[PDB]
Amino acid sequence: ARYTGPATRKSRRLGVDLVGGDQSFEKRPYPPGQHGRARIKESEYRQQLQEKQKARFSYGVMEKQFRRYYEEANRQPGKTGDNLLRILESRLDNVVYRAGLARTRRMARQLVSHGHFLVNGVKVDIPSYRVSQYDIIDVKEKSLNTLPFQIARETAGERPIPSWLQVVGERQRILVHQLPERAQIDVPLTEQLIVELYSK
């Protein structure tokens, strides 16, 4: 499935802004509901859980998929935290968002799911698609003139494109040199808390 409810709720509950530039979170940075002002009891479990919720509500990944990702990242011979972060970053919708072609991760996911993109010459419509080295992500010719891609291709002054990505074509081609490392990820939260939570 997918989460379709209000986005500001999660930002307010988690105490950080996940969309990035939302005014409602700044207007009220406290949890929602009647009792959004009550002091909370401090518990390591609560902090670890909130870190995991931050991670999986920033990228829009449900719990089962997140658990699969954590198992995959732990199995790998790196270290668990950055492995998980790089697996999350390698998603196609996240790549589209960080490529400056989508204002928000939700619209990047919507564009990918509608098959507006095309990876390595073959149409791909899977937001969970993972992107490998030397991947060429292209917009199909029919939808190049649509307003979303229009306003994406004339506002290329927003959030900087990370190093591991590079837009090279005036038609907004995307090239992937290598999977991102922990230094270049530039994500909120703490991976160690998630690793601790999933070892409980």
Partner: protein, 113 residues
């Protein structure tokens, strides 16, 4: 009679076969004396690998190929080598390799500039 059969593998839609040497009385997916190649008909050129020396040995002791295996043995030339009629000519149409991802990557980068 020991025979050179094709056992089935793969999932439901895509049958991928192994060229096995087995007794005629065993089931299709039973124990195999030897595995001497594989055959994937789902590909456009339908990849075929046959280990030539083992095939020669098993034909020499008198194994009987089935009809698909006989066709494959003719294609790879093992059957003709075993008999000797036209020679041992490789008619195998190998799959055409795909260019490397790095080649396409640098091609796109150069096309940008």
């Amino acid at each position: 009679a020991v025979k050179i059969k094709l056992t089935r593998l793969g999932k439901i839609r895509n049958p991928q076969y192994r060229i096995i040497v087995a007794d005629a009385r065993t089931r299709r997916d039973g124990r195999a004396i030897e595995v001497i190649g594989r055959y994937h008909p789902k590909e456009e050129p339908s990849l075929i690998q046959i280990d030539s020396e083992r095939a020669q040995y098993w034909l020499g002791v008198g194994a009987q190929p089935t009809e698909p295996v006989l066709a494959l043995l003719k294609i790879t030339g093992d059957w003709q080598k075993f008999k000797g009629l036209p020679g041992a000519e490789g008619t195998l149409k190998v799959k055409e390799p795909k260019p490397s991802k790095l080649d396409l990557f640098n091609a796109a980068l150069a096309e940008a500039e």
